[PDB]
Amino acid sequence: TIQNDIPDLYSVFKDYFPIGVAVDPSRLNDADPHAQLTAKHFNMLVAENAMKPESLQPTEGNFTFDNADKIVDYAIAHNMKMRGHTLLWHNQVPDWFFQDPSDPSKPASRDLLLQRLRTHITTVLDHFKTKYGSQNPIIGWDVVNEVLDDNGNLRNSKWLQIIGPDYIEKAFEYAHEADPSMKLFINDYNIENNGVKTQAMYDLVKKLKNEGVPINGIGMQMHISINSNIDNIKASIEKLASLGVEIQVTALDMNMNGDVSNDALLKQARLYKQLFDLFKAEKQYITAVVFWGVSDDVSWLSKPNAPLLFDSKLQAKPAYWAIV
Ligand SMILES: O[C@@H]1[C@@H](O)[C@H](O[C@@H]2CO[C@@H](O[C@@H]3CO[C@@H](O[C@@H]4CO[C@H](O)[C@H](O)[C@H]4O)[C@H](O)[C@H]3O)[C@H](O)[C@H]2O)OC[C@H]1O
């Protein structure tokens, strides 16, 4: 059971930015404590998995929007905005995209893969626009996810192998053409560490924006750890923000490296407080902060862990109280 009388988390940040959360469609019923926690504390929602490519077009032409729509219906019912995650990735994407349909032992051509990407993006954005219209809660999409490798080069996924480096620009062009009302993001992890990947994200967005690619924002996943350096996060935000794009913290959680002791929870609270003070300080750039999961028991990190503000019993942790 949840604590009904403690402060609604997002309300603490109303003069700064929406606070959202990634959810599973099976945790949205009124009587479910995870759904109670979701509606109480967040004013923004993201599908943890239901809007990924395999979740929306498992086989060619066979679109499966029921789970995504269940999440959108819930967001509408609770007056929450949404982020769309994600139109292109190298995981949770079906193999059929990359196969020649007459000979599945061979790869699709550059033109066929680009056409498939255009059809997927356009169908996905047109589905939400035609079904929900002005009530569509989605304000933007992660158009491409994790396109850099950890050395800062372009990740050599099947998209890069078949099409070449301009597949990124093309995804943005297709999404902008389908729905020019959506803010378009490039999303990635490790770009908060102020290392080679941060520099590479800055370089790639600088280049694509100067070429007229309609990129509106950079999504910083923020899968940080109990040992993360706040100074590196602040320097990454400043560097990426200098491009004149919005910054959203899209998938925040904290890896405890197996240490879930009471001492570690107190260290986690001090670090989360510093992190949120930094986000507030950078409110002129940051337009959303989203946690990657509702509570520790449903976090995607392997066990043992304690990554979020609500524990495995759905209770507020020391980090919740430090932030509010
Ligand atoms: O048919 C069933 C399968 O579909 C099911 O497969 C599961 C699907 O969930 C995978 O875990 C997900 C991996 O993505 C994580 O989100 C990432 C987090 O990192 C970045 O922020 C990134 O941008 C996000 O997309 C999700 O949090 C996580 O749930 C899982 O690995 C896979 O096995 O398996 C069972 C079948 O019945």
Reported as type and span, the H/E element at residue 288 is: strand 286-291
Which experiment gave this structure? Answer: X-ray
Using the atom order of ligand 1, give the atom closest to the CA of residue 187: 23
Q: For residues 165 and 157, give the distance between their C-alpha atoms in angstroms, rounded to a whole number.
A: 11
Q: Which of 21, 49, 141, 144 for mutating ligand 1's site (highest number of atoms within 8 Å of CB)?
A: 49
- Give me the amino acid identity at 243: L
Q: What is the CATH number of the domain that holds 2?
A: 3.20.20.80
The resolution, in angstroms to one decimal, equals: 1.4
Sign for the CA dihedral angle at 230, 139, 13, 35 comes to negative
Q: Which of 52, 255, 300 for mutating ligand 1's site (highest number of atoms within 8 Å of CB)?
A: 300
CB of residue 145 inside a 6 A radius of ligand 1: yes
Distance 284 CA to ligand 1 centre (A): 32
- Give me the amino acid identity at 322: A
Q: For residues 12 and 104, give the distance between their C-alpha atoms in angstroms, rounded to a whole number.
A: 53
Distance 109 CA to ligand 1 centre (A): 28
Q: Which residues contact 52 (CB under 8 A, 6 or more apart)?
A: 85, 86, 89, 92, 93
CB of residue 221 inside a 6 A radius of ligand 1: yes
Q: For the chain, how many structural domains are there in total?
A: 1
Helix runs in the chain, H state only? 33-41, 53-56, 66-77, 110-132, 158-163, 167-178, 196-210, 230-241, 262-281, 318-323
Distance 49 CA to ligand 1 centre (A): 6
Cβ(41)–Cβ(320) below 8 Å: no
Return the number of other C-beta atoms located less than 10 Å from residue 150's C-beta: 12
b/e 183-198 (16+ beta carbons within 10 angstroms → b): bbbbbbbbbbbbeebb
* Number of alpha carbons in the 13 Å side-chain half-sphere of residue 210: 7
CA-based nearest residue to 23, from 309, 255, 290, 294:
294
**What domain range is 169 assigned to?**
1-324
According to DSSP, the residues that pair with 46 across neighbouring strands are 22, 83
- For residue 6, give Cα distances in angstroms to 46, 90, 289, 316, 317: 23, 40, 20, 9, 12
